[PDB]
Paper text:
α-l-rhamnosidases (E.C. 3.2.1.40) are found widely distributed in nature and have been reported in animals, plants, yeast, fungi and bacteria, where they are responsible for the cleavage of α-l-rhamnose from a wide range of compounds. α-l-rhamnose is found in plants and bacteria as components of polysaccharides, such as pectins, and the O antigen polysaccharides, responsible for determining the antigenicity of pathogenic bacteria; it is also found in rhamnolipids and it is attached to small molecule natural products, such as rutin. The family GH78 α-l-rhamnosidases catalyse the hydrolysis of α-l-rhamnosyl-linkages through an acid-base catalysed single displacement (inverting) mechanism. We have determined the crystal structure of KoRha, a putative α-l-rhamnosidase from K. oxytoca, to 2.7 Å resolution with rhamnose bound. KoRha is significantly smaller than the other known rhamnosidase structures, yet it is catalytically active, being able to hydrolyze rhamnose from rutin in vitro.
The final model consisted of two KoRha subunits related by a non-crystallographic twofold axis (giving a corresponding solvent content of 73%) in the asymmetric unit, with each monomer containing a bound rhamnose. The structure reveals an elongated homodimer, with each protomer comprised of two domains. One domain is largely responsible for forming the dimer interface, whilst the other is the catalytic domain and the site of rhamnose binding. The rhamnose was modeled in a distorted chair conformation. It is bound at the bottom of a deep pocket, in a narrow inner chamber [Fig. 1(B) and Supporting Information Figs. S2 and S3], where the pyranose ring is sandwiched between Trp 341 and Trp 226 (which are structurally conserved in the other three determined structures) and flanked by other hydrophobic residues, including Trp 335, Phe 338, and Trp 510. The rhamnose makes eight direct hydrogen bonds with KoRha: the O-1 atom with Tyr 498, O-2 with the putative catalytic Glu 486, and Trp 341 (both conserved in the other three structures) and also with Tyr 498, which is only conserved in BT1001. Asp 222 most likely serves as the catalytic acid, responsible for protonating the oxygen of the scissile glycosidic bond of the rhamnoside substrate. It is notable that this residue is preceded by an unusual non-proline cis-peptide bond, which helps to project the carboxyl group into the active center. The single displacement inverting mechanism proposed for GH78 α-l-rhamnosidases invokes the participation of a nucleophilic water molecule that, in KoRha, would most likely be activated by Glu 486. However, our structure reveals no evidence for a water molecule in the vicinity of the β-anomeric position and within hydrogen bonding distance of Glu 486. The reducing end of the rhamnose faces a more spacious chamber at the mouth of the pocket, which presumably represents a relatively non-specific aglycone binding site.
Residue numbers in the entry:
A (entry chain A), B (entry chain B): 11 to 523
Write the structure that this text describes.
């Protein structure tokens, strides 16, 4: 897999690396876990003591506690501990376990049976040869709960903690305007959304601070919108644009995600939709930041994503389907992706035209003709009048995703599109949405068709459910009908702070809901 | 338990802290373990590749190897490793296990049952967030074999080690005269002995570098003898004398062992014999180093150990017996210790007299009378003519230890004592010796009675057995009839480099065997 580096673009990205603010926080309580069928993933917390009382305890082999930090934090653990009893005559062996949910410190990691690496699960053994001890752990953890287990000391002495804190980090340490909304339930959702984005904003826009700690293009697109009306760090959107542009496949296609440690390496994973989203991110960045220099410099990268995407169309102007993981759309293994991909192409071509009008007017003429072909081809090949929905693939599957994306693409007439959104509400497709990522687009489609009250009710029903369940930050994965669901094969390795799920802040602020 | 600090003595000890020499060593092979009934603790090594070939390997989840370092080392692990395949998209989770014997990296630590802390078992989990990686582990390990297990990486990449070394440490980095002996089997034993002492000589004379990494008085006594004819670091014997003298029980009794991290703390463990051995260590130090200043300064400490010990005698001059752990002698739970303790008292009183002659002549007069009382009382109460052995305790137990110590004490006549050592041949006592520590004294008793050929044969039979089994260093525990034996409950937590077992070097060199 041949790649191409662009030193000029990478030097621009490097110069825009943000400083991180570091800030200490103590935890709020010691708790005990109780298995409970009717709770957040089967486990309930009960407060048992303050921390001042825990600092008086003298722990022996086998003793363990769970520390509730009170909110969701990303950062570095610091603690002090010391001996009690006789002079300490052996190392103290501890085991630490970190969780975003309570369930992550109650279910054993040894039972994880998924296709992501188990190494993402947060855990650390320590051997203290000398007491008293001052410990600053080097790895960055993302957690609310911390389990501390004394695996082994000798019978001659006991261990005693005197201080525990987390040093939390973020690049979103600037001001953040308060939301106007007079609706208390939307306010609560906005608060959770903003915290979600804050913890994801680091040296790049990370998708999730526990996992994958990495810049992805689909995620970036949504995060940039929220950033726009919260922390307004346009320099960081610019940095992330130059990163994707600075290291590409040799034919010019941008990667789905980028690493920045130990140096900038772009992944060998390529997605039809994420590539095209480079165009929409560049367009939204121009609108919000008003930086013509950057948009002009990066336009060729955007244009190239379109040149390459258009080669996937057959003679009749419909995107070819295949069984490999060629486009993302949602975490839904049974989803045929052809129709949704057609919609993404048409959506992003439209933005390529708006950009072309400024930087390459002559090309906009032919792009406009091409837009028309694709929309017509979508109607001819994909629309099914009897069902009132678009079908996808050789077996003519009906999904939510197909409808959402072809409505956003503005295929057909405004009243046809409004009729489709009513059809979802009264006659729901079989293949459902699994992520707040895809739900974001459902909301956008509702608003675009002037269904404003329906969009408000939908934000409240879906994201309000996560809030009512007790979420501090919004989740990577959420299907209300199956709250245990994981595409990875364990809810333990899902992310519970994922910024592609924090767009309600944008909807609420931008549309004045 | 009230203690007393002596700042003057501790400042002298601190000023004599030795510099450590650090020196790099590569391992010699990759091996595979095979369960084998007739081998060193049930496990046999087979070489499978060089290290140059292992540095070409690309390891995935579940792969593991065993690295043979070729000898016994004490020090710090350094290695480099890097990614292969796709760009690394998750942390690399490794598990390291360290063993002095092969069995320690083959038997699972999770099965350890014992009264010593399991935290002594050497083990370390690592999560590498970034590759390539340069790793220098901070803890000091004592090992020959190293197991390296890749617990988890993702399917997209593999791990590849490019260098592995141990940085070995010791304070015995000076010259060391070669042994004269023309006997090839004694030469082999001397080589193993010298390496044993070398690894135990650190910032103090440690009893064992894996465990307990600590200065004990009984161990010190034997280590100082060997030091005398090998590395000749008298400054270190002096340091260790001032440590025991510098922090005592409030009534003046020295502790059995001393900690030196984070500061000097003497243990709350007190042993009749180890306390008295302060006298013999001071005496041997004067003979070898010729340092009258130190011996004069520390004489009051020595004298006080005798004052206190003599209070354990009844009116008739026999030491009172009890079932608590009041005296050490050997790791033998079934041993009645009264007779051996009587012998240790008489042995150490004799040295207190030789010291008193120089620093307090008037006291030697009464000590000489007391020596006579104790020897007489030993004959009257403990000698059994019908059996030709000394008995110990109310149940008149016959042990090896009783005979050994009362012969070293020079109770009775030279011929009586020679007849006792012959009797150990013809009617071996029921309660056997479990350590090379006690065996050292058996050898000394043989030599003292002029049984020189028998002492040579006994060094060869016992220590030669450990060599023939494949030992790089001599062991803390060794009963030939039960090689699996542990007073701690698992052979995993025994020490396999214990300097109280390296005295053959002294015997061989000092007596020109
Ligand atoms: C497809 C890509 O990878 C998944 O693991 C994460 O959910 C990420 O947010 C998504 O954009
Ligand atoms: C009794 C004392 O402690 C044991 O654990 C060690 O074997 C040490 O060497 C010994 O001197």
């Amino acid at each position: 897999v041949m790649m191409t580096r662009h030193p000029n673009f990478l030097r621009t990205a490097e110069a825009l690396r943000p400083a991180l603010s570091r800030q200490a926080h103590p935890p709020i309580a010691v708790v005990e876990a109780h298995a409970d069928a009717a709770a957040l993933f089967g486990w309930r917390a009960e407060p048992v003591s303050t921390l001042a009382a825990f600092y008086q305890r003298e722990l022996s082999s086998g003793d363990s506690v769970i520390i509730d930090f009170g909110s969701h934090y990303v950062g570095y653990l610091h603690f002090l501990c010391q001996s009690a009893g006789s002079p300490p005559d052996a190392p103290a062996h501890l085991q630490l376990t970190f969780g975003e949910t309570l369930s992550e410190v109650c279910e054993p990691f040894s039972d994880y049976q998924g296709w992501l690496s188990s190494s993402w699960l947060q855990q650390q053994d320590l051997w203290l040869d000398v007491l008293p001890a001052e410990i600053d752990l080097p790895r960055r953890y993302c957690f609310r709960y911390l389990k501390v287990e004394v695996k082994a000391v000798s019978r001659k002495f006991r261990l005693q903690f005197t201080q525990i804190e987390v040093n939390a980090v973020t690049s979103a340490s600037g001001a953040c305007p308060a939301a106007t909304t007079s609706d208390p339930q939307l306010r609560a959702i906005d608060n959770v959304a903003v915290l979600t984005l804050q913890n994801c904003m680091q040296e790049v826009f990370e998708d999730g601070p526990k996992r994958d700690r990495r810049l992805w293009l689909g995620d970036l697109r949504l995060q940039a919108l929220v950033n726009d009306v919260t922390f307004a760090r346009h320099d960081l959107v610019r940095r992330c644009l130059y990163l994707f542009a600075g290291h590409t496949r040799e034919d010019g296609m941008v990667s789905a995600n980028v690493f920045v440690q130990p140096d900038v390496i772009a992944d060998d994973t390529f997605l039809f939709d994420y590539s095209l989203f480079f165009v929409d991110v560049l367009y939204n960045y121009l609108q919000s930041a008003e930086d013509m220099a950057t948009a002009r410099e990066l336009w060729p990268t955007a244009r190239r994503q379109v040149e390459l995407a258009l080669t996937r169309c057959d003679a009749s102007g419909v995107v070819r389907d295949s069984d490999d993981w060629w486009v993302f759309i949602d975490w839904q293994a049974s989803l045929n992706k052809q129709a949704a991909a057609q919609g993404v192409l048409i959506y992003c071509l439209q933005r390529a035209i708006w950009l072309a009008e400024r930087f390459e007017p002559e090309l906009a003429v032919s792009y406009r003709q091409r837009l028309q072909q694709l929309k017509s081809a979508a109607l001819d090949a994909l629309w099914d009048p009897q069902q009132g929905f678009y079908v996808s693939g050789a077996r003519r599957q009906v999904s939510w995703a197909s409808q959402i994306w072809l409505v956003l693409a503005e295929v057909g007439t405004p009243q046809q599109r409004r009729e489709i959104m009513r059809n979802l509400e009264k006659n729901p497709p079989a293949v459902a949405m699994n992520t707040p990522y895809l739900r974001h687009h459902y909301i956008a489609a509702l608003l675009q068709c002037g269904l404003r009250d329906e969009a408000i009710a939908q934000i409240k029903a879906y994201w309000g459910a996560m809030v009512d369940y007790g979420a501090d930050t919004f989740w990577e994965i959420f299907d209300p009908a199956h709250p245990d669901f994981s595409p990875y094969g364990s809810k333990l390795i899902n992310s519970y702070c994922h910024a592609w799920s924090c767009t309600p802040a944008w909807f609420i602020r931008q549309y004045g809901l």
